[PDB]
Amino acid sequence: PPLSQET
Amino acid sequence: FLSLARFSDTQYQRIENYMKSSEFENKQALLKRAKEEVGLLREHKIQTNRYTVKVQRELELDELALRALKEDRKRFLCKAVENYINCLLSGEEHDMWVFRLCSLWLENSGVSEVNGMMKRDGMKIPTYKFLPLMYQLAARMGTKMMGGLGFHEVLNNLISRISMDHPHHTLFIILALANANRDEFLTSSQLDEDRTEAANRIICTIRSRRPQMVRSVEALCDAYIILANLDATQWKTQRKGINIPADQPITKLKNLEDVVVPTMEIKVDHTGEYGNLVTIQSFKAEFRLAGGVNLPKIIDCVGSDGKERRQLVKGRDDLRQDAVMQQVFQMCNTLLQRNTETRKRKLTICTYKVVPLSQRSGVLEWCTGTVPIGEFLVNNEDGAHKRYRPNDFSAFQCQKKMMEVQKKSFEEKYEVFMDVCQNFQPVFRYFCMEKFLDPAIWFEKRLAYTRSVATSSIVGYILGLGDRHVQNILINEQSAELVHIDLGVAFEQGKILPTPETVPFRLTRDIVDGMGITGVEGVFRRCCEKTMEVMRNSQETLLTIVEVLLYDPLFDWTMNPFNKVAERVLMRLQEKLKGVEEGTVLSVGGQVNLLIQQAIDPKNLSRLFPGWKAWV
Amino acid sequence: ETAIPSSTRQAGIIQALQNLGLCHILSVYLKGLDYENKDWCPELEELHYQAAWRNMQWDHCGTSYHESLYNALQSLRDREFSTFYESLKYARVKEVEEMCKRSLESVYSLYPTLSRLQAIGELESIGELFSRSVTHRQLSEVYIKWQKHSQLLKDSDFSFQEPIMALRTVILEILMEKEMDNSQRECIKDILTKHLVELSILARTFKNTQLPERAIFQIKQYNSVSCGVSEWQLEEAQVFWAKKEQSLALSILKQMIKKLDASCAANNPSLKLTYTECLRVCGNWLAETCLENPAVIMQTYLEKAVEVAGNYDGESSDELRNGKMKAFLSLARFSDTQYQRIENYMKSSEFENKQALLKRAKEEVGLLREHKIQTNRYTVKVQRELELDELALRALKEDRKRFLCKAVENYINCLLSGEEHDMWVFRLCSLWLENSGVSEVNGMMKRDGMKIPTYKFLPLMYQLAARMGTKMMGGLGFHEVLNNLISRISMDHPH
Amino acid sequence: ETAIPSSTRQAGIIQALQNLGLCHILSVYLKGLDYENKDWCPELEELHYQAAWRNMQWDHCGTSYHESLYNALQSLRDREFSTFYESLKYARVKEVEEMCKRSLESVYSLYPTLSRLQAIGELESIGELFSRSVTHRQLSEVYIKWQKHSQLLKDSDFSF
Ligand SMILES: Nc1ncnc2c1ncn2[C@@H]1O[C@H](COP(=O)(O)OP(=O)(O)NP(=O)(O)O)[C@@H](O)[C@H]1O
Ligand SMILES: [Mg+2]
């Protein structure tokens, strides 16, 4: 899962 | 000369602040009312009584006072500019005030006298003192500041002379400014067109004297642009490496003699000739993907010395904000070095060069000798938490709980966060313990780590940096100093995200435990107080650095048809620097304590994004 | 500087050391002078005797006033009353004759003689008390007489009061030394502690920090800490605050609060009043230094102290009502300062610029909603920042209104049964006439403030009589309550 | 405060008096200590010698660094150089051996020893200058060298 909160 | 200039500048700033206050507006409204009443009393035949004479005399006194104040302010501004010019004509130890001169020259371009004195006396000022503010000068070619053609022509002449003297630090900025629409051309208001035309004039003027260097640099820039625009969506499943197709001009672009690598900082000297700089020799035939939706590209370049240097080309992203962040980082580091209180403490900010190449693309220097914090701490295979505390909950379990609780309410989120923190103890404190067996070196690295953490947290809070998860911070394996690499979102952007950022900086349990037994109290608090004091003393320089906006807005703003959000962020930064907020005064110690309380509050950590790894 | 002759240079050095709180250093310096200099001049010998009796240096052996005082103290310690009385009589005669021999003509010269004679009289009273036996009632009456005399000496200079306090401290130390183990010893210890704390405030009000520190050191030497902190810990915190040690004082006071609020159990009303005073002091310190936002500290300290004082006011004692009035005044001043700061912030040009930006954002959002446009990242960002700005503005307005209401209510509470805080009524008017548009404050004024005595508005009677104009349209309620108050004031004081 | 043992309380008082600019008061206080206390501990004796040489109290009469410095100053004032050089050599040897006997491992501990050795070297240079005669050029060069070295000591602490 992506770490940063995209958009 | 410096004392006289400082006094004149202080008086001018005080007068300007007084004129911008609400009291001055009320006085002007009263004066206008008096003027209109006198006009009506003169139009109609009315005898002159005591009241009429009193009103006329007080109006005359007010007009005389206003005229005297305006004349005194103008004379103070002229004296300050003249004294700055005199001090900088043959001065070396007072070179840090040049920004103030710009703050008194660009903001007052409407006056012809100051422009004439700048073009008459300041024309002989050495060109190596304007390099830190070269971007600011290059961002002022817009016609929105209508102060006559003299200011524009003298600014263009000064920029051309600076570029001729130091082509290494100047051509890249002009080419990046002129390549705003290069991506669309290879694959827009009146102000943008005027700025592009001015940049093209500067480029052609420079190439008239150095054709080969300019053409090589622009060819390299075009190769970087076309590499960034390359679509690598078909190579997202390959991690070992993908060969760049031969059709790209970068592959055939080799053996550069007049081109210096942009990602490496160059120690500028007082001579206009450079012959001992590392140039570009060759480019590697393989590139790697760093991950993400935008798919940044990682390249390796071999220079004249033969040492391979890693660069990160970030396509479909704007690095102009990151360029401003790096510039203000360097400014803060220089200010900390200048101050004797922080010079002894050796407070420094780790910076990496970022070179914008277009409005939607750019390059940055890759950080070597550093390891991600998350890779060291919460690695699935050989994580520190698993190695030291096998009985504690694994990272996968915490992620699963966070995913399952995001659909719950505040109480359940707080309870699960407290339960996770209960069964997850910090392990970061062992880092130096496992890398520096010598107690002296261990304590030196720990102290450097604490000081770097304090300074970075303070600067991030000032700049509103929010994207601070484990993958955005890299810890050095030798100096043990944290480096911020992403800088993707800042200027209070976390609140815009669906999950608001409730902390100003990352001060999780791992960081505090790694700082030592004393925790936040001790080195961290004193370093934060010193940095805050330095920033309060140099708010003028900080605002001068950040005021590059309002003339060349970056991407993602002013779309979908004096910038709105730029003015808002400038106001927010000024409020943070002055410690005013909603009219309340806060001391440096009180501000530091409030920031610590907000950062270490579990209530704020509970509402953070689960991918931010608040518990970690 | 060595150019000053040694006749007065040594006296100046000794006086400076005495006023700097240095006793042992002064004793060793005087011993060094005795070693290097054989003969003793009358001035230096008098200073030697003063240091000997002040420092309780009983080892060291006409006569000056300090010599006579030291001899009388030694005789009292040796239970020889005859020589003690004779020495006091000789000192009185010597002081009177020395005072009357000069040309006089100056009131200021009488003060040292009056102080010395007061000290001699106090020592006479102590000797009379200690002639045969000491009882609790006699000690209590002596202490209340001393406190009354000190109140009469409030306007006097600290120079003329310091010898009196030093002699009182020495007397209490002597009584403690020669007291058998019983409840009388505890009573004398409590009296000594109270005298030391009164000396601490007395020296603090005169910009002196060394003597209060010495007093706290003596208290710590005699008194001992326990689960329930006494009232001298607050005095120690205040003393450390006066020494620019804000962090240490705040930490000590926070520890005191943490100890008190967890183990109070309504053990003693004195503990309740000292807890209220500590809470008020902590609130004032946080308000002045601004280490935390007012929202949490106000509720943590000021309202807690107010409710603690108001929940146990069944005795209506002076020592409770004065503390309640002080807490009310502190809370009212904090609320008024916060309201004034908020109003000044709202009237600044920065607030006007923020309002203009907010209006621009509102109109842009309106145009974007009127025309069918897909929601991109920029539109979402603009909408979210507009919502945050609106929420912040609403919260600021609500907080300002609550601060105004709290300030008005606390002014009313303080002025309902207060006399020493009657100079703040103007501020209440400044928070009532300028805010007549709010119906809540007018209703609270007409409900709770209607019983306020009418003799406190006489200096501002003209101001009230100048506010019947209709230009301040804030409803008929404000006008009618103002008219009723004016009529009541006129009926009470027609002159 | 009297709870602190007199072993370090007296040293702290003397140091505070030295840093407060009080010299004659410190001398009288030390004389009072000598009167009330007979035996002298090494620390208080070293402080006594430091105050004696710093205040030019020539009336007052292994050896510590301050004792050796005072003896060297007295020998220089008496136009005696052999004992002066021997005392400086003994002080250098004592300082070096005392510094090297410990575990070291800290840079900050080197600063007092470096300052003491610099003082000894400056006294050696002064003795060499004053060995036979003094000239304007020699004094000027000594002063400019001292000013240059002090410029090298701008970043150093005031204590050293
Ligand atoms: N200066 C740098 N040095 C080393 N690695 C870096 C640097 N900058 C970025 N990275 C790495 O690049 C990857 C992500 O690229 P990044 O520059 O953060 O843009 P990004 O893809 O938008 N990241 P994100 O915001 O989470 O989407 C991560 O693996 C980072 O560790
Ligand atoms: Mg990133």
Residue numbers in the entry:
A (entry chain E): 12 to 18
B (entry chain A): 2387 to 2573, 2591 to 2964, 3002 to 3056
C (entry chain B): 2052 to 2112, 2121 to 2554
D (entry chain A): 2052 to 2112, 2121 to 2219
From the paper:
The structure of H2O2-activated ATM reveals a disulfide-stabilized ATM dimer, having a unique orientation of one protomer with respect to the other, with the autoinhibitory PRD element displaced and a p53 substrate peptide bound. H2O2-activated ATM exists as a dimer. During our data analysis, we did not observe ATM monomers, consistent with results suggesting that H2O2 activation involves disulfide bond formation between ATM protomers. By superimposing one protomer of the basal dimer on the corresponding protomer of the activated dimer, it is apparent that the other protomer is rotated relative to the aligned protomer. In the consensus map for H2O2-activated ATM, we observe additional density that crosses the approximate twofold axis between ATM protomers. This bridging density is absent in both our and other previously published basal ATM structures, and we attribute it to a disulfide bridge between the two protomers formed under oxidizing conditions. Upon addition of H2O2, a disulfide bond can form between C2991 residues from each ATM protomer so that the PRD can be stabilized in a conformation that clears the substrate binding site. Once protomers are rotated and the PRD is displaced, the disulfide bond can form under oxidizing conditions to stabilize the enzyme in an activated conformation. This stabilized H2O2-activated state has a conformation that enables p53 peptide substrate binding and remodels the ATP-binding site to increase the catalytic rate.
Ataxia-telangiectasia mutated (ATM) is a master kinase regulating DNA damage response that is activated by DNA double-strand breaks. ATM belongs to the phosphatidylinositol-3 kinase–related kinase (PIKK) superfamily, whose members share a common domain architecture. ATM is directly activated by oxidative stress in vitro and in cells. Overall, ATM emerges as a key cellular sensor of oxidative stress, initiating a signaling cascade to respond to and alleviate deleterious oxidative damage.
